[PDB]
């Protein structure tokens, strides 16, 4: 009884404090600067050989090698410079949802509808690849397990729970709770101390690895959240939702700054990404296209076309030289 | 270049292995099994598996029972299966609207607009006993039952009451009304009557898959 009244009073106080510190807007300050114009990109390489749709991808740390995962139970490693296959690993379970690449290039991980994110070893004396460890402590399906170091990994599953693992012993150490719907994505800070997540209850949270407590919460959307990415500076991020919108949040103010919305667009967004200098924004849509937005002006500039089915992954190299996309027709392309 | 020609050799070998793998992959049919509790789904047969073979043809069947009750996110994976098997219990009148609602929700999806459905009406023996003895009515739950007549296409079993036939065909028409209302000609529905001790259940799936493939092929030559 009194709990709901106290919650309402606290929410009113928080909203008053948050709205009491807004003087101007971002669009009112960057009016004087000139726009970027028009940018056109042409595909350079096309990679073929997969049997079914592609669900995930990841770039290497040297921006030459990349890995891909397919629904037929395969995990191939490519050489983007010369389009040469280096490895081909068969999976025990056909349903796979994610993949990762270690920073040092010695391990590869994957997981899916089997509630397990496995670890593979790439440099062995016998000359082949083999499973090094298996982790099983989750209930629902697994949507993202992302490396943090050579000895620890961060995983988010579909039972509204995130955890921090220990590869050496296989036992989890820290558990994060607080969401209501299942978690769909996460991103890591450049210093590897903080990370964010987006669930299916239209909210996002900022966690602390060392302690294990929530810091602050941002809510400005209206539907489920499908993707999230971090600003190169380390003090902002962008999210993609199911109502065809993107928003930019500021950590130091706990308010949204701009909305990237346009008419005659009625499809959701599956993935977002930034650039090396943080001046452009790329987003993949369900209408078989890809758009490039202007971060400081929120107006479209350039389109990427050529796919014949919905896109499902998107990434940018560490040195900022190429973009790679994968779709549901099992073709990978590199733009420049 | 002596160390870069061997890389091309290795890549060609890997590609030739994938070529062998494709032929094995392409010659197998997958099936998805759905339903609810108290339906005898397990009697007919976070991931299960079951492989059976008929006339030197391989079939794969999956069952999902390790997740929560929210199925609007992991159901997009099964968008390229051959067919979907739906199991209902046609002997309890208190839980028919739920089955109808899930059937409608599955049928009217956007990523599953080219997938056919094979429908099993399980537990056909308890319904006859319930109607013959007599302790509950049907017009109390469905008011439309008071103006139903058996269609001329009926094929009653030898030596059975016509009331049971009317009850069976009303329940079948309830699903057929939804099935034949939003079809553009890309997928259909195959009704069936199933008992708890029947022995011929793989042949029905065999024939239904054959019919699905034949219709799909005939459609695109402007012959259908």
């Amino acid at each position: 009884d009194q709990l709901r009244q106290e919650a309402e009073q606290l929410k009113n106080q928080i909203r008053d404090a948050r709205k009491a510190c807004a003087d101007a807007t971002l669009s009112q300050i960057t009016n004087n600067i000139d726009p970027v114009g028009r940018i056109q990109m042409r595909t350079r390489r096309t990679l073929r050989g997969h049997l079914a749709k592609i669900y995930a991808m990841h770039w290497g740390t040297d921006s030459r090698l990349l890995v891909s995962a397919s629904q037929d139970g395969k995990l191939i490693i490519w050489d983007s410079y010369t389009t040469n296959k280096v490895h081909a690993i068969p999976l025990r379970s056909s349903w796979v949802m994610t993949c990762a690449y270690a920073p040092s290039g010695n391990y590869v991980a994957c997981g899916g509808l089997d509630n397990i994110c496995s670890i593979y070893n790439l440099k062995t004396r016998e000359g082949n690849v083999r499973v090094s460890r298996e982790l099983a402590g989750h209930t629902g399906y697994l949507s993202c397990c992302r490396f943090l170091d050579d000895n620890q990994i961060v995983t988010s599953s579909g039972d509204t729970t995130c955890a921090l693992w220990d590869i050496e012993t296989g036992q989890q150490t820290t558990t994060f709770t607080g969401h209501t719907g299942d978690v769909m994505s996460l991103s890591l800070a450049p210093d590897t101390r903080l990370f964010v997540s987006g669930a299916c209850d239209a909210s996002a949270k900022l966690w602390d690895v060392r302690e294990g407590m929530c810091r602050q919460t941002f809510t400005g959307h209206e539907s489920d959240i499908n993707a999230i990415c971090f600003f190169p500076n380390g003090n902002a991020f962008a999210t993609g939702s199911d109502d065809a919108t993107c928003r930019l949040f500021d950590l130091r103010a706990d308010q949204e700054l701009m909305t990237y919305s346009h008419d005659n667009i009625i499809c959701g967004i599956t993935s977002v990404s930034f650039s090396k200098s943080g001046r452009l924004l790329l987003a993949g849509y369900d209408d078989f296209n890809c758009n490039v937005w202007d971060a400081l002006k929120a107006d479209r500039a350039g389109v990427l076309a050529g796919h014949d089915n919905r896109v499902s992954c998107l990434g940018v190299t560490d040195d900022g030289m190429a973009v790679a996309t994968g779709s549901w027709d099992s073709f990978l392309k590199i733009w420049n | 270049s002596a160390e870069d020609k061997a890389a091309v050799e290795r890549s060609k070998m890997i590609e030739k292995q994938l070529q062998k793998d494709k032929q094995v992959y392409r010659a197998t049919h997958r099936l998805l099994l759905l339903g609810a509790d108290n339906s005898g789904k397990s009697t007919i047969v976070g991931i299960f598996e079951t492989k059976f073979q008929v006339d030197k043809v391989n079939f794969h069947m999956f069952d999902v029972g390790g997740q929560r009750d929210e199925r609007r996110k992991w159901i997009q994976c099964f968008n390229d299966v051959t067919a979907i098997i739906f199991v209902v219990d046609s002997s309890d009148y208190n839980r028919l609207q739920e089955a109808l609602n899930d059937f409608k929700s599955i049928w009217n999806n956007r990523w599953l607009r080219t997938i056919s459905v094979i429908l099993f009406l399980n537990k056909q023996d308890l319904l006859a006993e319930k109607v013959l003895a007599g302790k509950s009515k049907i017009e109390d739950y469905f008011p439309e039952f008071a103006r139903y007549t058996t269609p001329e296409d009926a094929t009653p079993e030898p030596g059975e009451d016509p009331r049971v036939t009317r009850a069976k065909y009303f329940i079948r028409d309830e699903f057929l009304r939804i099935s034949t209302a939003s079809g553009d000609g890309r997928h259909y529905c195959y009704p069936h009557f199933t008992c708890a001790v029947d022995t011929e259940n793989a042949r029905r799936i065999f024939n239904d898959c054959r019919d699905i493939i034949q219709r799909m092929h005939l459609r695109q030559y402007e012959l259908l």
Epitope: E126, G127 | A2, E3, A6, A7, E9, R10, M13
Partner: single-chain antibody, 230 residues
Framework: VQLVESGGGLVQPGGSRKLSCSAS????????MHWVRQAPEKGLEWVAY????????YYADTVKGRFTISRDDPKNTLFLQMTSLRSEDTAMYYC??????????????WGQGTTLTVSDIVMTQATSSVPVTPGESVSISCRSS???????????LYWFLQRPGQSPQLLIY???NLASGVPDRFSGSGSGTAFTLTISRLEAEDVGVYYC?????????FGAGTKLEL
């Protein structure tokens, strides 16, 4: 990992034999194989090479026309068939493995040896070396006769060490990065024609003969070797 070979003996001129290299401990179906011979008074010499899947075979030019190489994957065996031999074939043969892909490390494991008693880029080493007391600095240089940069930033030059009474071991590949299992006290660098080897700390278990090898054109040429005394 283990490689065992059998054969050899005493052969009168005009005869024939057969040598077998048996492998056990690794995937035999993904590696190429090499045969290397060592004269009793000279350095190493290349003989033959068979690829993976038997899709490419090469020979040097002092044997071609009377030697044959073959493999059999299911039984994990390597064969060498010889036609009538001359008096210059008195040498001990070795069995080597190598795998080629981006970032690999060829020429890593060697064989044991076999006695078969019967009776072009030029790389030059010279001057041997005087005995060295432990705790000093030693430098070894190998001179080539052609550029070894293949227009893509890769320089091909390998270094090997043969302890007395044992088999050669790999130290450095591509003249830049060190191999696995070797202490990090070895460094190597050089220009496109001149090369050198640097060792900082001298111990009592680093005595032997060092060789410089090149892998740019498939007729492979070794060096002459430098002996370190104590």
């Amino acid at each position: 990992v283990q490689l065992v070979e059998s054969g050899g003996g005493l052969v009168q001129p005009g005869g024939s034999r057969k040598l077998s290299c048996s492998a056990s401990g690794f995937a035999f179906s993904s590696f190429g194989m090499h045969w290397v011979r060592q004269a009793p008074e000279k350095g190493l010499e290349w003989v033959a090479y068979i690829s993976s899947g038997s899709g490419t075979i090469y020979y040097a030019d002092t044997v071609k026309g009377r030697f044959t190489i073959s493999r059999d994957d299911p039984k994990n065996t390597l064969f060498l068939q010889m036609t009538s031999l001359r008096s210059e074939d008195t040498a001990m043969y070795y069995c080597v493995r190598s795998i080629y892909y981006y970032g690999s490390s060829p020429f890593d494991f060697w064989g044991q040896g076999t006695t078969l008693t019967v009776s072009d880029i030029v790389m030059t080493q010279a001057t041997s070396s005087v005995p060295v007391t432990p705790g000093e600095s030693v430098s070894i240089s190998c001179r080539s006769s052609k550029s070894l940069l293949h227009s893509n930033g890769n320089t091909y030059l390998y270094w090997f060490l043969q302890r007395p009474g044992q088999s050669p071991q790999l130290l450095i590949y591509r003249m830049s990065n060190l191999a696995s299992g070797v202490p990090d006290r070895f460094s190597g660098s050089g220009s496109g024609t001149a090369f050198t080897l640097t060792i900082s700390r001298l111990e009592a278990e680093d005595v032997g003969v060092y060789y410089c090898m090149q892998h740019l054109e498939y007729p492979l040429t070794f060096g002459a070797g430098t002996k370190l005394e104590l």
